[PDB]
């Protein structure tokens, strides 16, 4: 059990190196490699840890990050920049992994070796694809820098103007790379990217501020500002269609299912805007004193009507959950 415990220790040192890569940045395959090896079962164990390394590369996807919220224009660019760095390290580690000794181990019994060698050549090709994705991600990281920098003040006035060119850059990115692997999958990321960005900008311009303005009921222009925020979103969808024409084929996008997250936000926003405008109306009704013919009895009836409204708007001001959260129904 001396040699068995030494094997149990090595697998522990691998799992520690896997934990190192979890906090740090992968490089499990290097720690899976046996150190100062002199039987044939030991060199096989080294290959089996190399196997779970190739699995970690394929395990990582652009879609799984999109599933668990997030999907920020800066976040997806960084996810490709982190993926392209992990494969670049794995390619450098593959050059050290592929030792003259490690080649002789594969020769002496071999479909275990060639499957690990085949996954390596697939990783090396996908890495070449990842590197072009990283060059594309680096341009979006500058675009996201334009949005991430925003301190939630104005923005939507100029960002609605700045969006059309941000789209025009994305279109040119498609033509320049050419061999851009996952050109229909990367479109789902870019759309989710603009999606998450709009949601952040929108959460700022309303939230407790919109609840606070409704409370005081001395804000009409602020209601119009909310409509302007929605208009900025409409400009992004209009520019997305304006880029789809500029592209001329291979539109892809699938906004009718993808942009549903955005559409559903704007629907809820619009629904508030529809109800906020009516609240401004009723405020005018109180002030009205027609004075005509039969009197008081009518103004009393108008007063009771105004009180009912005042109860409704007070119940709306409560803003229990809400805070223009699309995900919340």
């Amino acid at each position: 059990v001396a040699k068995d415990l030494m094997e149990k220790f090595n697998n522990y040192v691998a799992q520690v190196y896997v934990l190192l890569g979890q906090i740090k940045g992968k490089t499990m395959l290097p720690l899976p490699s046996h150190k100062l090896t002199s039987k044939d079962k030991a060199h096989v164990f080294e290959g089996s840890i190399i196997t779970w390394t190739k699995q970690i590369k394929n395990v990582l996807k652009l879609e799984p990050e999109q599933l668990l919220k997030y999907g920020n224009d800066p976040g997806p660019l960084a996810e490709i920049e982190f993926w392209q760095n992990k494969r670049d390290n794995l390619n450098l580690i593959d050059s050290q992994l592929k030792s003259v000794e490690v080649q002789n181990i594969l020769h002496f019994l071999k479909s275990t070796y060639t499957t690990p060698f085949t996954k390596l050549q697939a990783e090396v090709k996908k890495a070449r694809l990842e590197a072009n994705e990283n060059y594309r991600y680096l341009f979006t990281l500058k675009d996201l820098f334009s949005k991430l920098q925003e301190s939630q003040p104005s923005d939507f006035p100029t960002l609605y103007e700045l969006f059309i060119p941000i789209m025009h850059t994305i279109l040119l990115i498609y033509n320049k790379s050419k061999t851009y692997n996952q050109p229909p999958r990367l479109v789902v990321l870019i759309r989710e990217i603009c999606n998450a960005i709009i949601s952040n900008a929108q959460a700022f311009v309303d939230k407790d501020t919109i609840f606070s303005l409704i409370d005081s009921k001395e804000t009409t222009e602020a209601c119009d500002k909310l409509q302007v925020t929605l208009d900025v979103c409409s400009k992004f969808k209009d520019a997305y269609f304006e880029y789809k024409a500029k592209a001329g084929g291979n539109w892809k996008l699938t906004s009718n299912a993808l942009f549903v997250r955005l559409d559903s936000f704007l629907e809820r926003c619009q629904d508030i805007l529809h109800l906020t405008n009516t609240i401004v109306q009723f405020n005018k009704l109180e002030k009205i004193e027609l004075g005509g013919t039969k009197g008081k009895t009518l103004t009393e009836s108008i007063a009771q009507i105004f009180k009912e409204f005042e109860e409704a708007v007070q119940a709306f001001t409560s803003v229990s959950y809400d805070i223009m959260n699309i995900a919340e129904k």
Partner: protein, 50 residues
């Protein structure tokens, strides 16, 4: 009635006092210059790698 009559006078202005001839066309021309600037930036980002 006077306050509402004053609002109608102010409303006619607010609509056609701050209103300026050729507005949407100028915004489109501003967008075009930003599109050309972004097109030149992506070319410069292509030249850096290359």
């Amino acid at each position: 009635l006077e306050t509402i009559k004053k609002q109608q006078e102010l409303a006619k202005r607010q609509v056609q006092k701050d209103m300026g001839s050729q507005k949407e066309k100028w915004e489109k021309k501003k967008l075009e210059m930003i599109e050309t600037a972004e097109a030149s930036f992506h070319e410069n980002l292509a030249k850096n790698p290359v």
